């Protein structure tokens, strides 16, 4: 906590993180000008489904035919995840500051404020799926060895916003948890 | 406008719901058509996922969503893709733009993507009624071969639902 | 088009349901294929989804919707598999629970072992693989014909194949 | 198997007083700082064990079988296969052949394909205990890092069934 990167874009850092849960973490992240995010519902579905399956009984209240079905789903899911890792290009690992409003992350190339595009993020880790969020560049600055971008997400809509808030809240208690 | 083959235009759309929309679609010549079951399953399934029980079932559903999402993306990122474009679609046939003209009577299959998030294509065997060009290019008038009870009921529901969505 | 191998045609098709149909099939000379379990799972599952094509509402609405998602996933994965698989040559074949007679691009001596490769359903890009040996290879006007005798199937697979063949027959008489 | 005499201390640490299965399967050790995931490993093992065993529902189950089979095929297209060799496996660690030898203390991940009909791999973080050669190949004695209650139980169940199955005829 207490990273000075915010001194590079005071007004932007305040817009994105003031008075709202903001998490500083490392995960595959990136920004691309030529969007192709998809829908709010896809992002929302990814986040919610991800929550229902994660964060660390069948013989009872349930038969056994359904346990097998659930087993098969776990297997299919793992295999489809394996398939994806085979072709998709992974995002680079980076330290980012993420809130419901936007994100501060490092980028190979600077981009003037006003540039529009999509923030790419791999939320999970065991699942090679990306969360894409349309966003605009609020600020762009360097610290000497990396170009930093402050991106503000375009309106997320009621459902996705909720899923994202829950997502951030969970990540936060867990980071504090394993401490 | 449409009246560059009024003969077919009337056969395909007169007195029946005919929607005008933009969706990837195309005509592919072949003697190897698809199946009615497959097309019916595709249509009804898209519709049943329009908009609970023990926790294990709720998480099974979450797992399904994740699988569908991942598999859907893989297809969409590696496919040929059909030509986006304005088409006129009814339970009887479709009015779409094709790269080249075709002699009427030419047998083949109309391939269209009924939904855009899901990259699964709908395959319907059809014959060309007319092939007049003018919109700088060649427009085709395709007549679906008899769909059969089930698939026809599915297609009408699809178009009706699709129309209200649009008319709102 | 069967006298080319009298005894072999009698061993594989005498006093037993034998169907004549066209589908992608081939014989692959391989050391060891295997897995009756995979072959049986395929045939039994196909049959259930084949019949799908008991009660409309019935169970919870959520369930019906999950089933739909399954139909979508299967279709999508099917499409993906076709984007890079190798289609097998379509051909007429005589198929019994004991063996199969098909057209091969080349001939093989009696005793050659491998797997009979078949695509059971046109809508599903999945292949059925059954270990088999060649007990007859002869030629007629042109094409090379092989008589493959399946290696023992085991209780389950046999039942699955017999069921599959019977339904195939029944549907065939439906013309 | 006399491979143990090549590294008595390690062989004893990994297989003494515990079920140890000698079998053939694709398995490898790769130097990496990939912490893997206990939850992923446990899910794989329990699910595997589950399948190693109203009409609408039965149809759904049929669809799952078909999907699983196809997805399996896809992965097997462009996936880097593991080396199939004889191994010695216990809940504590595993002895397997390796391309290069490694100094004891070297940490990485053991990769192996639990079932032969599915291309899904199990990853388990481990450290090299011993590393010796029999004149033909380099053998490694890897000690899995703590598995955690759940994963450990799943693995114990997995090895026990495996041992049972193989004691037939």
Numbering used by the authors:
A (entry chain C): 0 to 55, 62 to 184
B (entry chain B): 4 to 54, 66 to 182
C (entry chain A): 4 to 56, 62 to 183
D (entry chain D): 2 to 54, 68 to 183
The authors write:
In contrast, the clipping treated with the xcc6012 knockout strain (XD62 #2 and XD62 #86) did not cause as much damage as that treated with the wild type strain.
The final structure was obtained by repeated refinement to a resolution of 2.1 Å, with values of 22.0% and 24.6% for the Rcryst and Rfree, respectively. In addition, XCC6012 contains only a partial c-di-GMP binding signature motif (SxxG) and a long sequence of 57 amino acids comprising two α-helices (α2 and α3) after the β1 strand. But unlike other regular four-stranded coiled-coils, XCC6012 is further surrounded by four additional α2 and α4 helices, forming an intricate 12-helix bundle architecture. The heptad repeat of the α3 helix contains purely the hydrophobic amino acids Val71, Leu78, Ile85 situating at position a, and Met74, Ile81, Leu88 at position d, respectively. In the surface of the coiled-coil, a pair of salt bridges between residue Lys77 at position g and residues Asp75 and Asp79 at position e and b, respectively, are observed, which stabilize the coiled-coil as are generally observed in other helix bundles. In addition, several hydrophobic residues are found to locate at positions c (Leu80), e (Leu82, Val89), or g (Leu84) that are normally occupied by hydrophilic residues and exposed to solvent. These altered hydrophobic residues are responsible for forming additional type II helical interactions. While wild type XCC6012 exhibited an unfolding temperature of 57.1°C, those of the K77D and D75K variants revealed unfolding temperature at 44.4C° and 53.9C°, which are substantially lower than those of the wild type by 12.7C° and 3.2C°, respectively.
